[PDB]
Design a protein around this ligand. Sequence first.
Ligand code: ZN
Ligand code: ZN
Ligand code: ZN
Ligand code: ZN
Ligand code: ZN
Ligand code: ZN
Ligand code: ZN
Lengths: 274, 274, 274, 274, 274, 274, 274
Amino acid sequence: MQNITYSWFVQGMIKATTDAWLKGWDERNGGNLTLRLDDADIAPYHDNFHQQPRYIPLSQPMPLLANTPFIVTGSGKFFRNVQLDPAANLGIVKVDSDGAGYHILWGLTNEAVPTSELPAHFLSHCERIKATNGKDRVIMHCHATNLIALTYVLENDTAVFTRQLWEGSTECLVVFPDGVGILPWMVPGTDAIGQATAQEMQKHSLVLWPFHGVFGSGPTLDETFGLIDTAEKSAQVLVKVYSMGGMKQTISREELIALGKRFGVTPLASALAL
Amino acid sequence: MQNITYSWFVQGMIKATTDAWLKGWDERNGGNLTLRLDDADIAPYHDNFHQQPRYIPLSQPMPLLANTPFIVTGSGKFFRNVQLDPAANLGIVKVDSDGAGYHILWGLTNEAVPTSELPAHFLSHCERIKATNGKDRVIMHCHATNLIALTYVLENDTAVFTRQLWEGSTECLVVFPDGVGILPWMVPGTDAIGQATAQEMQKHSLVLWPFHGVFGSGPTLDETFGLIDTAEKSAQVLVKVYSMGGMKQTISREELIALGKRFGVTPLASALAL
Amino acid sequence: MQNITYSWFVQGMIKATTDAWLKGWDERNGGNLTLRLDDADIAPYHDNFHQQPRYIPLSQPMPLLANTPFIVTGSGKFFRNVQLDPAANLGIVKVDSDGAGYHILWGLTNEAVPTSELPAHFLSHCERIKATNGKDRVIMHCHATNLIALTYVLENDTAVFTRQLWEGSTECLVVFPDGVGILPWMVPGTDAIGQATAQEMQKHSLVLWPFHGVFGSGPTLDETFGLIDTAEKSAQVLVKVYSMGGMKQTISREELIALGKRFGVTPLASALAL
Amino acid sequence: MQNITYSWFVQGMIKATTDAWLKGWDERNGGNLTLRLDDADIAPYHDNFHQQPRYIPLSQPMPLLANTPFIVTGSGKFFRNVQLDPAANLGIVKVDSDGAGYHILWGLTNEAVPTSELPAHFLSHCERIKATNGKDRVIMHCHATNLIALTYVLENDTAVFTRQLWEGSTECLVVFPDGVGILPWMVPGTDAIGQATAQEMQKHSLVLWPFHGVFGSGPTLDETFGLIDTAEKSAQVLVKVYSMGGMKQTISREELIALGKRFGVTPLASALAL
Amino acid sequence: MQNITYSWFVQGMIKATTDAWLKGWDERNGGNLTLRLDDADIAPYHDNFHQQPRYIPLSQPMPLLANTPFIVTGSGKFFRNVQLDPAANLGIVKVDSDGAGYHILWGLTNEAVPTSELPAHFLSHCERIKATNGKDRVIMHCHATNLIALTYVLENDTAVFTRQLWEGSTECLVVFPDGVGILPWMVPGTDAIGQATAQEMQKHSLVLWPFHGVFGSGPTLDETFGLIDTAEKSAQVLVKVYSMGGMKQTISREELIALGKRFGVTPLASALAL
Amino acid sequence: MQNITYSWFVQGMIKATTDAWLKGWDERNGGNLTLRLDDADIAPYHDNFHQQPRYIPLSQPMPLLANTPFIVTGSGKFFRNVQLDPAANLGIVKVDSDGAGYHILWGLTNEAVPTSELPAHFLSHCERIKATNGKDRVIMHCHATNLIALTYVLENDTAVFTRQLWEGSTECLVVFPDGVGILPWMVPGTDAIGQATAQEMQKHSLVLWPFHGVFGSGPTLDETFGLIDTAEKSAQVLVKVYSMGGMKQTISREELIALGKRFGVTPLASALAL
Amino acid sequence: MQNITYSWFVQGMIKATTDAWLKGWDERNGGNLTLRLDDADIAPYHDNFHQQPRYIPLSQPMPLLANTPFIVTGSGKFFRNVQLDPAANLGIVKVDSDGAGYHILWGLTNEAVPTSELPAHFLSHCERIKATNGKDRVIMHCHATNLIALTYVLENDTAVFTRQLWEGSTECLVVFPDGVGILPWMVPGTDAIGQATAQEMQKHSLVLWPFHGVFGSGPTLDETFGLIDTAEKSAQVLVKVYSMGGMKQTISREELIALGKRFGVTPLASALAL
Ligand SMILES: [Zn+2]
Ligand SMILES: [Zn+2]
Ligand SMILES: [Zn+2]
Ligand SMILES: [Zn+2]
Ligand SMILES: [Zn+2]
Ligand SMILES: [Zn+2]
Ligand SMILES: [Zn+2]
């Protein structure tokens, strides 16, 4: 069989992390990415797996993810280095029969282990799975520059932040009509911040971590990266506007509503109501 | 036998200088990089060494560095060109038995010499070796754009500056808990500034040269580049924030303290006190 | 004999124009580059020359440039494409024995011609040849973004502007101690702007064209590009500083003097007595 | 971004050709090497590819190789020089959608073309792909000195030759249990010899060209070089033995059979029968 | 602490295998090397060990080697590749408290395991330890070219072979006065061939495996390599002599005896008696 | 302008003489090498030339070599040292306008002179220039080991020897279809041997000096070295074959003819009608 | 003051022993080298000398060597290791005021002593000093492979052996016209062999020790190594010839006489009247 590093998902992971690194969203080891795969995706590469896969317990039972394989970025790993050493920076893990832990089937060579925001990722995956009926398969976290900067000047309010981002680029309301969830600052790499994020994932495909980064969910690598890139693009436009003195004009609520009606999507009411 | 140009350290140097260039931190020949190697690293390449190495007396003798080899960037060399002609822009030097000078074993072709800031590097290498018990092996200087810009608007005070950078990105306190040392502006290339920088290196892994650049130390090329990139990323976020009118909210002291405990690290007290 | 496209000068031209494009200094067909070569440089490529070199009369004869060959960028050509087809975008021309005109020995295919500014370039090359005793060999014009932006906010005075750029990065005084000449806005492409620029070139290696771009001169492609890149980097830093409210501190007048002293260079006096 | 000259496959090619050169198996431009890559291998280096790849019609269409990339040695190129200028001596080619020809994406500078024996390589690649179910990726030809010398004193018979080589070193039967195919002398570079070699490749991983050289196939550069080196080592031992008067004792058939069972491998029956 | 790859023993292993590869004694994965270390040698590098060392049972109990650490070459590994990837090709193993098996403390990355002639090495180590009172610490196997060739024309007799080798170079009797043991051909990588070799190791520091290679033991890496190199050198001289028609004259028994007396060593009686 | 030592011709000279030394063809001061350059080659290195070029009168004037520059090996110089000090062992000479003598423009330090055979070389360069219409630029003499050995066992006849070498490696007829000229043994260093060699050069690119060495001519350093290396490789194969008892089979007379036909070359007729 | 490790003589010693190791002439610790220096040579490094030089009483006083300094190889040292640690393998010794003993001024660390044969060397140095009017300064002993092999097949007679070696390569008669002295086999390290060798040194610059090695003397390291290399090259050619059945043709007695006359040297008469 073909080498697993040449698979669609491994190549996709390389592409997403590499593009993110070039965007300037992932300095050092900042950010992480997890993709939910199907048994059939990895079945072809059984001969590539470690002969004695490492098992690592899971922070809290996640029955819904039992026997579910994921390709993930490693803890403390650089998005910049993914492209040339995939196995060292990426790993394929599989939650066991009862979601108690997982085995590292491939990659994460040299005692490496999955990302430290993993308990956060799995929790959000579970919620996005129910919220989107199994359609969302990607959870991506990165340090989107402008989005971060905005968390220091905009009221950390979901409705307020969502509305500004919708205003920052015409298609934002269409790309993320459910809005963006904003959590209060919280210590990272914790079951706690993972819980809260997962809770926001029930209501939004996008979640902001003030003074830190963004969390996005989507059906595919491109759609997810695209989701984040759209919000960051709006944020980038907003940063320039604010820096110039603020909005002289912008998209009106009636207009935002008309936009929603046209693309047959229903905008977060609270944000829409401003 | 493989050419030394294909060794891990030559490739590493190419990578670091190339990335910093693409970042826009090294216009013209600004910046420099020195990496401490082990004789075992260069032993395979005896055949690539200059038959009669050019000797270069070291201003201040550095016995601590005796018989130690380094790969360094050249004087008057462009980071942008390193990838194009490694031997012309890089050089491997070895400090003699009593650290009175060094021989250029490889590179630095057409009578080129090491970075003029080399002695300053050596001083800091010595202080970092003692401070980290020989773990640190890299000294990197570059003109990180936003970090530079901030030295014109923030109080050139170690505690204040460190506190703002910690605030600029959640990860900063964990990446550089020892904070950032800020020297007063000084004529570059002098023994004075090298002395003062080395002084600061005793307390910090990061040192700022107002209206000029940054100085970083770390165990590997990636960790040091990563260290600088993290600080520069925070600085970039701060520049946007300040440009928008300043912080409305930020990470709290108590939060910064919690962060410190969560990652088993002790934050520069003076910076926390703020 | 390798193809001329592989020659150091054709490759250097590609590198410079490409780097400039990647910098954002050469949108559309903005900018141009001319490099003075020696006959020995192009001698080995007689096989690559055009059988019937085309001839073009020089409006104003350049006697001091008699029999002098140059590699130049074409008129209407995009810096971005130079790398996609060197011969189509670049051309090697040789002024005849009496400086009456030149022959297009290579490149400039499809009947393309040198930059319509070749005559202005020639005028400055002359002034620089005299000013540097034949060391300067390059004239480069590009639309350096931040330098342009600053011409809308800073006094368009050689002394004031020079002072700011020196302050924007420690190395600037050392790189261009003669300062930067600032002409008043003028219609591009006129013998007047060419004459005025040439006049400024007698005193400065860098000349600014308000609301338009920069003009630089130097001994090699890297040095000239490096010169411009250094000024643009300082400008970039200044734009951020001004955007944040202005300098809280900067390099003192006395410090700049010390810097000059140390590197054995004499700074434009006017810039230090504002 | 790292230059493709530093990729694992370019370095691998440099290593193999350099080692064979040092072995004395590749005088002048004798010998050639082709390695089948995956699009994922060259995908990171899009920026190093020729803007408008030169297309080269393939004599015999090879649909099995459609859209497949290879790194190959050039025609008229010296193995000894590969390490000195990779781009000049090596080239990356990609077979078009229907295997009618290929485009040269990188290398083979100054209008150089792939080894003239390329079509022969492609034929064998096809037979080895089928024979090993896509495991083999390398086809290497060189003038192994002792193997050549033996073709003048040993009966040019597959069974006989294989038996002697197995006897020349204990490890041989385990390294090449399928034996060595011996073709009759044939004019090189012909479609005839490429056809016959490919034929033999269906049964053996090693093929001898009397009074000329050896042809080997394997999964990786090292395994193929290693395969050839093993046969050549045995041949070298045999040359010394014959030169001393011949074998007094040797490995027995029954012993060769035991060896075969011990390592779970089935020896070419005809060779064992002897 | 210092990285283990920079230790004396790791560097020694690299040197021995590399020199052996250059000698032409180790094609492909031919040959193996094991060195007995002391706890104190590796104690300094505890932090380099795998966090979960792999355990592998031992073919047969070896109590005498309980808690004994060794640095060994991996199975199927190339001597040629040791120099640039030590951890992948070398491994540090430690026999457990009762010599039942060992843990792979360092190296042998990527599911690699110790050499296949390991049960042979340990058995010979045990015998050489008692035979030399713990002074011998190295066991080296390689495919010494001429020694191999001679096993096909010389009577595979210890006394006979030993005598010819003594005759092949004056100092051979002084280097290996105990002679060379010659086993009958035997299937390799077996407990059997390991037993027989160990038995010969009781009487000799050198053991020949007809049509395969040599096995040597000594106090250090250099002394052992030197031992083998001396025998191979004599063998090389013998091959040329035989090829020229045989000995016209040689060292006499009286002379060999006098030689033994002078260097105060007692020559194998049987071999001496011829 | 880089130093001349880095020029392609000085580097080529180092490469050729070093490779030859590593081959065992140039013990002590055996052998010499001269390369005909073009003025454009050395023109760019006017700075590296000797202020007062030394002049040496040519016993016999070479009018056809007027104003022709060559890089040559020095008299009494060791090929092995060329790499340790190019200027000391190599020299660039230029014959004057009337071919009366030459000026030592570079190298040949400490009053060293060109090979005492420069005049013989010049004589052959002349004959080769005429024979190849100015393409051949190199004359190389070395002590090719096997070629020398064969002159003691094969008939020293151009046709017989040529036939054997063609047979020793398939490519030989194609590389040197004009065959190899064999002179009778003669005292080296005499105008007689130079005259006779030059005479053979009119017909062959390769000339043998029985019990001494080989003389080769070609367009570039690599081609000439390659030419010699090819003949020596065939010779090497022949030595082994003869040592084993002679050819049992070989390339037939008809096959050699076919080979010639295929590569569009006409083989020395005498060599095919023995 | 420069370091002695980079002195011409220390580097020369490294180069000679290293080249000899690469030649395969110095397996294990076989061979030795001593070079006679002038005080002017080592004087500049007095600062590197052992503060309290170790004295060594010499077997028998050698007034001719009074106050004479030598750089020598150590006892039991490997030629292969000299390049790795010069000070450990080499030593500079100076003969006292009355040739009674010497002081180890430099090197020979960790209690190492000069080659066990220093006195035999000294003995020959004396004879060569007288024989060549103080021109010879080097005594070198190594195990030249082919020369050794020939001592088993050629009559160990000075005249007969000398004639064959002269015949093996045209320049041998010119290089060593006084021929090669052949001693009968003798126990190495005895006063007798040293005496006998010295006696032969009065008449020859080259002495053979049957079934052991060669002994050479010359003015410089290169000339001496070159002398031995020339003889070994001839021997190498002879071994091939004899292996092919013997000389069919060779250099005639008359031709050898003409060669001698031509280069103004008088060949050992006995060798030319067999
Ligand atoms: Zn994060
Ligand atoms: Zn700087
Ligand atoms: Zn413009
Ligand atoms: Zn071939
Ligand atoms: Zn083996
Ligand atoms: Zn010669
Ligand atoms: Zn000896």
